[PDB]
Each structure stands twice: as C-alpha cells, then as structure tokens.
Ligand binder design. Structure first.
Ligand SMILES: Nc1ncnc2c1ncn2[C@@H]1O[C@H](COP(=O)(O)OP(=O)(O)O)[C@@H](O)[C@H]1O
Ligand SMILES: Nc1ncnc2c1ncn2[C@@H]1O[C@H](COP(=O)(O)OP(=O)(O)O)[C@@H](O)[C@H]1O
Ligand SMILES: Nc1ncnc2c1ncn2[C@@H]1O[C@H](COP(=O)(O)OP(=O)(O)O)[C@@H](O)[C@H]1O
Ligand SMILES: Nc1ncnc2c1ncn2[C@@H]1O[C@H](COP(=O)(O)OP(=O)(O)O)[C@@H](O)[C@H]1O
Ligand SMILES: [Ca+2]
Ligand SMILES: [Ca+2]
Ligand SMILES: [Ca+2]
Ligand SMILES: [Ca+2]
Ligand SMILES: [Cl-]
Ligand SMILES: [Cl-]
Ligand SMILES: [Cl-]
Lengths: 444, 446
C-alpha cells in the first residue's frame, strides 16, 4: 500500500480522499492555497504545504508547486480529485517523470479520452455510438461551419474540447447565431481552460443523462458498477444525481455496462472513470469520458457497497481488481443533492462566513462536506460546498429521506440552493422519474 | 394506519423516532419537560405538549400528563422509546385502557419479561439455561442468603429486579460483604426504580455480553436479527457495542437465535426486543430481556438493512412482519460508541452549554444526536447525548472508520467521553476482538 500521498485538491473531495487514506493507514499531505488554511481536511492532514496564494492559477493549478510538495514531504503518490489538474495529461506526465505515482490513468489515456474531440473519435473507432457532430475541431471558415450544422441538423451545440462543469457550451438554433456563438464559446474556453478548441454536436431534444461507473486495474481487468442518472441540470451542470437510473432494466444495464468494461480493456484504461451518455428512445450515445473520480460517486457507493476512492488507491498501488463482475450487486437506491453557495433563484455566488451549521443525520443519510460554523467560503473557487446523499431500500424511501434531511440541514450566513433542492424533491415529474436533461431549466 | 403518535421520550431516541415518523408520513406529538423546549425533535415535531417541569419523575414519568397529551391531540399511538416508562407494565395497561396503541409488547408480557426475576423463571421454565442464582426474590433471612451464595459459589452479584443501566447491582466477593450489599442494593433500587426487589446471581468471571435482536408481530411470526457484542462496560453499563459478535459461528448464531424466536412465539411477544446473554466457554446464559427498542439498535440496522423503528411502527399498526428469517442477511460490521456529557476520567456528569459542535461524516458514518451548537445539556437526565455508529465491509474497516470519525467530532463547552472512546478504539486487544465484560475497567484501573 502507498505510504504517503499528496491530496492535490480542496473542499469536499480533498476530505473524502483524506478519510479513505486514513482508513487504509496512508499518510496524508494537504496542499492548499493561502485562502484555504482553515479547510477541514487541511486541519486533519498529517502534513500541510502551502502551494501559493488564493487564485487557482497560482495554487491548485500550480504543477511545479504540487510536485515539489510531494518531494519535500517524501510522498509517493498524488491524488488529483476532480476538476483542477485531474484531467490534465501534462500534469500526469510530470508527476510520473518526477518519480511519483499519479492516482489516475496513464498520461496517454488522459490525452486519448480526456480530450473530448479525441474521445469521440476513439469511441467511434471502437464501434461505440456517439452523437452526430463535426467529428473534429471547428476552424474559422463560417461556410464550412454552416455546412456541418446543415448536415447534422439544427439545433446544434458548440462544445469546448477541454470543457468542464458545463462551461464552454452554447446551444445554436440557426445560422444567424452560429458565428457569435462559436466566437463566444472559444473565448470562454480559452479563459477557463487555456484551450480554445471547440467542436459541434447535434443538440438532442429529449434525452436523459445516464452514465456508467467503471473501475479498471490497467492489467486487463475491468468492471462496471451500475449506472447513474444525472438529468437535473442548470447551465449544463448536474444538480441532482441518483443511482441506479430509473427505468433501466437489468438486461439494458448489463448491455451498456459490458460495452463500457470492454471499452476500458481495449484502450488500456486504469483506475476509476465514468462513461457519460445521452439516453434517448432506448439508445445510449457517448458524450464524455471522465478519466478521474466523479463528484457523484457516493450514490454508486451506496447501492454497490464499493468504496471507489479505496479502489483508486489499491489500483495505484499496483493491486489487481479484487471485485469480479459477478460480485457486483445493486441493492436499493440513492439520491445526491449538490449543495452550492449561490442564490437559490438568481444563481449568483454567495461567498462568506457560515454563521450557523447543522448537518442532517439518521439511518441512510450521508453528509459529504468540509463546511462548519465559523468557516468562510472563499470567492475564488467553484460554488459546490457539500453533497447530501440519501440511501433507501427503494427510490420512494430515498426521496422521502432526502426531503426530511434537507429540512434538517441548516446553513446560515450565506445563500444556498437548499430551498431549490427541496423544490426538486417535491416535483411531481422528478417523483415520476426519467425527466430529461432540459427539465430543471424548463421548470425554473 | 398510524396517522399521529406521541413520542414519550427525549434526546437522541426521540429524534430517532421522529425521523422514522417523518419518512412514513406519520404526524408527531413531542411531549417534553420545561427544560426540553429546545430539543431538536421538539422543534421539528408537528405538535408539542409540555408534560411537566424539569425532573423526570414530574415529566417523562408523568403518566396522566402523557396520556392527556395523546387525548388532546387525537394521537392514536404512543412510542415510549427506551428507559422511562418503556418497560412499565402499569403505563402500557393505562395507555391501552385509554384507547391508544402502546408501541411495544402487551402489558402482561412486560410484567412477565420486563421484571428480571420473573424473566429468569419464565426462561428456566422454557428450558433456556440461565446463570445459577436465587431463582426468586431475596428475603431478609441471612442464613438462607448465605446458603444461596454457598450453592452457586462466590463471587456473586446482587441485582435489582427492576434495574436498568447498570444501576442497582453490587458484586459480592464473600460472606463479610453480603448483608450490607443486599441492604444497599435494595435501597438503591427502591430510590431509583420504586422497587426494592433484589435477587442473587453467580458472578461470571470471563464472559462476553452477547445479545440477540428479535422482532415479532404478535400474530405468530418471530425472527432474530443476528447478534451484538456489548462487552466494553463501565459500572455494568455499555460503552461500546458492535454487530455481529466476533467469533460467534453460524451454528451458534442459529442455535441461540432460533431459541429466542421460539421463546417469542411461546410467550406471544409483540414488537422489537432483545434477549441478553452472558457468553462463556461456548455457552449462553440468559440474564435479561429488554421488552423495548435497544439504545444500540443502529448497529443491527447497519448490518441487516432493517429499519427497527419503522418495524416497531408497522407491528403497532397491526401489520405482519415485513421479512422472513431466510431473508435476514448479515453484511459487513458496525461499531457504536456512546457519547456522554461526563468527565472522561472520573465520569462525573458534565451538564452545560455546547459552545462549538461539529459532527463527523463520510461513507459508513452514522451520527445519532439531538445536540447542536448553543444547545444546553440539562442536569436532570441521563448523561448520554449521542451515539456514533460506523459501518464497514469488515470489522477492521468499521473500527478504522470510528477512529477517523472520533477525530472529527467536536463537542466543546462540556466534558465528554470522546477521549475515552478514542482510547478504546486504539486498544490492541479491542482491535483483536473478544475482550470480556471486565476488560474496560481493568484497562482503566477501576
Ligand atoms: N476539464 C476540466 N477542467 C477544469 N475543471 C473541470 C474540468 N472538468 C470538470 N471541472 C470542474 O470540476 C468540478 C466537478 O465537475 P462537474 O462536471 O460538476 O462534476 P462531474 O463531472 O464529476 O459530475 C466542477 O467545479 C467543474 O467545473
Ligand atoms: N449533444 C447534446 N445534446 C443535448 N444535450 C447535451 C449535449 N451534449 C451535452 N448536453 C448536456 O449538457 C451536459 C454537459 O455536457 P458534457 O458534454 O457532459 O460537458 P461537461 O464536460 O461540461 O460535463 C450533459 O450532461 C447533457 O445533459
Ligand atoms: N427498567 C428501567 N427503568 C428505568 N430506566 C431504565 C430501565 N432500563 C434502562 N433504563 C435507562 O434507559 C437508558 C438506556 O438503557 P441502557 O441499559 O443504557 O441501554 P440498553 O439496555 O438499551 O442497551 C439508561 O438511561 C438507563 O438507565
Ligand atoms: N451474573 C453476572 N456475572 C457477571 N457479570 C454480569 C452478571 N450479570 C450482569 N453482569 C454484567 O452487568 C451488565 C448489566 O447487567 P444486566 O443484568 O444486563 O442489568 P441492566 O438491567 O442494568 O442492563 C451486563 O451487561 C454484564 O456485563
Ligand atoms: Ca459531463
Ligand atoms: Ca471531463
Ligand atoms: Ca442489560
Ligand atoms: Ca430491562
Ligand atoms: Cl469552500
Ligand atoms: Cl431531540
Ligand atoms: Cl441532553
């Protein structure tokens, strides 16, 4: 087992990783910005290294500071969490070349599957259905862009190849808006991701977002761990996730899961990852592979019993897969509500001091957050401050449980989306299940 | 069926019951003392009724006030939780006589099995091995009392028939301490339980405390839900509980579980309950049946997936058991640490205002408590303020989770036993498993 690791992240995921480390007796190094000294996991970590001032560009994206932190503490591995450098092939490469284990896929796999244009190309090559699109980067020729749009059929969406969290995405309904949309998306993607490559994809009218969790050891064994439905979204970012996906039958589950496990073996995938699909009229269409842990991984944990972070760590230690496919069993249902520090109605950021906090508790309730009363939410990072996950023997119980937990959850001093999450749980169509990716913004 | 119930209790268990009701759409009436207006479950309840001033004898033991609360709100059932009036046959009778459902066994069953002298007699009648003892109440004849102690062999223990929480129990090493030990336990039992009846039991030197969770519908169906080891103890009261019990083999689990389920059917048991045993040399010896929910019920919930409170309510509504025996599956391991507002060294109660509170979290971490920052723990009640329960795929993972969760738990402003629980989890002998009921006080030097 890994002796010591740097947790190259912050907030809830850094604490999630710290806990898994502690259970496995792995020493922890928390690297943090000067704004994050009072993070719960920083205070719990065995060692801490300040890697720069508050802006992410100067700290959490500071590759040489993070790699140096591993050297100064004698760590043997680095866990990137999600976001930040986790899908950055350059970082993965540099980690390995400095003598450290990168807790994730090989750098070449991150280039293959992390970049969204080449992932689509790879999946098409593999015989995995994708969404019709430009099948390559858009150039500057507007006649050519219009011609691609016409071939696939309006509406379309301009998507950043390096995009994440729904940033760098713009829907286009017709020719008149195409140029300014491609131009704006490029500018957003260049700013957020230092990568102005965009592609075009057909905008699907009625799909659900359904994704399959995979685990592969890099030795040729791969498994799938059921699926998740993450169709409740705002600004193309997930708000609620659940597992398993409602209406997905065992026959269909195994069909898509086997395809994902096979895809892992073929490309030589290593570690945890997720294949994300649009599910429409009984068919799955590949949109993205996250070559990293998923934010919403706890719902899969609840319904399978598998600890996905521990599996990541075991795999990084060069352990083969312990779990066989036949040993994976879906039991019950879990729902996750993201908790974000933003106005529940205007959706504008609400950083600042949390004056009162109370987490919910009870049978089947899991709270995933670094926040505490007295803690200051900084302005510099993403608004997601916590995750509430409720498990039940069935979906009705899980939702009932969530409804009650959200009523017990207190976060005062800043604005949150807790009241929005309450509204979603009370929604007749969410209760029905199988609402499409456009539903939440329709409702709102 | 149950559209409104009175929660006849307080603190963590009241909140536990409330949560089950909220999930089932059951309206709640929180009865409380004047010192308990700001209890979390009171604030969350649909309706609240003040049943008396601060002392328990004037509030949570106030039978007329609790029944009046049920009457005035139009409640159909009353959950007594644990402690207080949960094992009070007179209360159960009166609740039933007044036209309400008592969420628990029939009153006759409470007097048969709640009373500890009759429970032993009943179990002996049914051919279940008990610990050798007086087999009846102790009188005032000391020549007879000494004769009993001779038959069973010192050390012996004087136990209150109405006793609970380790109160009203004294170990006797020889004839020289016998008479005053009897007199003092009588006195202690009289003041604490309004019952001076005491009996004598052989004091077992190397047993473990292993208990079997049961559920029965009162319609003839009865099941056991594996077992719990509760051997970490101070002053004869549980400090740490875990499930399943280490080193209990499948043949032993079914042997004892089947006996307990049969006993339920035979006495017409209804609801949740626990048969408590001393386990030594591969043999079980019955000591107590709790005719009510256990404090440590969550460890069994985590390894079986069964919601025990919801089952109590279902049974109380007249529904048959939701599960057959062949459907009970044990998966993983769970450990519970009780959290008490007390000096971690001397164990003197530590009431007062909680100035800072932070609860642990994560995969497999379950925190069961009403406490919050700004909350004042009153001097009037039992010191237990919360329970931390950690589940894992195996015992090692559960313990490792508990270590981590204990490091996260912040309760400032009052003394707690958090530091004790940390020491227990770090104990190598505990980590191996199977330590006996005397181990913790041995470790501490008590
Ligand atoms: N390629 C990327 N580059 C930078 N940040 C990213 C990237 N992908 C995701 N993120 C960020 O990571 C966090 C989690 O991503 P999100 O899409 O919300 O969850 P997930 O993809 O795990 O369901 C968000 O703050 C998001 O903006
Ligand atoms: N071609 C499409 N048609 C309709 N909706 C889409 C399409 N592509 C993406 N979306 C919606 O936007 C969300 C974010 O897109 P995704 O490609 O996963 O970007 P990110 O890398 O930012 O997560 C998806 O979950 C889906 O609901
Ligand atoms: N027969 C009884 N009468 C009054 N109080 C009781 C009785 N039995 C238990 N209690 C109280 O109930 C609480 C829980 O009991 P305890 O013995 O700690 O848990 P359990 O028996 O559920 O493992 C304690 O405060 C204890 O003093
Ligand atoms: N005969 C005995 N010999 C040794 N230890 C005992 C005996 N009876 C009880 N104990 C210890 O004292 C604890 C409390 O006894 P119990 O009869 O369960 O009383 P209570 O009603 O207070 O829970 C038990 O859990 C056990 O560890
Ligand atoms: Ca995505
Ligand atoms: Ca991605
Ligand atoms: Ca007992
Ligand atoms: Ca009892
Ligand atoms: Cl934050
Ligand atoms: Cl409460
Ligand atoms: Cl209290």
């Amino acid at each position: 087992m890994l002796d010591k690791i740097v947790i190259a992240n912050r907030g809830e995921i850094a604490l999630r990783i710290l806990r898994a480390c502690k259970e496995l007796g792995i020493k922890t190094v928390a690297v943090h910005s000067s704004a994050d000294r009072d993070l719960k996991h920083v205070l719990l970590a065995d060692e801490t290294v300040c890697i720069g001032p508050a802006p992410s560009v100067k700290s959490y994206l500071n590759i040489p500071a993070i790699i140096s932190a591993a050297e100064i503490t004698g760590a043997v591995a680095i866990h990137p969490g999600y976001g930040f450098l986790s899908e950055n092939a350059n970082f993965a490469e540099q980690v390995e070349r400095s003598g450290f284990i990168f807790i994730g896929p090989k750098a070449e796999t991150i280039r293959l599957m992390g970049d969204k244009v080449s992932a689509i190309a790879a999946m098409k090559k593999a015989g995995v259905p994708c969404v019709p699109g430009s099948d390559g980067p858009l150039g500057d020729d507007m006649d050519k862009n219009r011609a691609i749009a016409k071939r696939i059929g309006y509406p379309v969406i301009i998507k950043a190849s390096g995009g994440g969290g729904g940033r760098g995405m713009r829907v286009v309904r017709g020719d008149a808006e195409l140029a300014q949309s491609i131009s704006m998306t490029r500018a957003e993607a260049k700013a957020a991701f230092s990568n102005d490559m965009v592609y075009m994809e057909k905008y699907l009218e009625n799909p659900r977002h359904v994704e399959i969790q995979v685990l592969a050891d890099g030795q040729g064994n791969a498994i799938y761990l059921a699926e998740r439905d993450c169709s409740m979204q705002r600004r193309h970012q997930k708000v609620v996730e659940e597992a398993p996906a409602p209406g997905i039958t065992p026959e269909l589950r195994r069909y898509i899961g086997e395809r994902c496990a096979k895809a892992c073996v073929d490309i030589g995938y290593r570690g945890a990852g997720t294949f994300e699909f649009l599910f429409e009229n009984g068919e799955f269409y590949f949109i993205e592979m996250n070559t990293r842990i998923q934010v919403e991984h706890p719902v899969t944990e609840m319904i399978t019993g598998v600890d996905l972070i521990k599996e990541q760590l075991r795999i990084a230690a060069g352990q083969p897969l312990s779990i066989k496919q036949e040993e994976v069993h879906v039991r019950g249902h879990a729902v996750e509500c993201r908790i974000n520090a933003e106005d529940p109605n205007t959706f504008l950021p609400s950083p600042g001091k949390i004056t009162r906090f109370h987490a919910p508790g009870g049978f089947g309730v899991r709270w995933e957050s670094h926040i505490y009363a007295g803690y200051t939410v900084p302005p510099y990072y993403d608004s997601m401050i916590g995750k509430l996950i409720c498990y039940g023997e069935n979906r009705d119980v899980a939702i009932a449980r969530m409804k009650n937990a959200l009523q017990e959850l207190i976060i005062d001093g800043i604005k949150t989306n807790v009241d929005l999450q309450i509204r979603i749980m009370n929604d007749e169509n969410f209760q029905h299940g199988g609402t499409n990716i456009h539903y939440l913004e329709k409702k709102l």
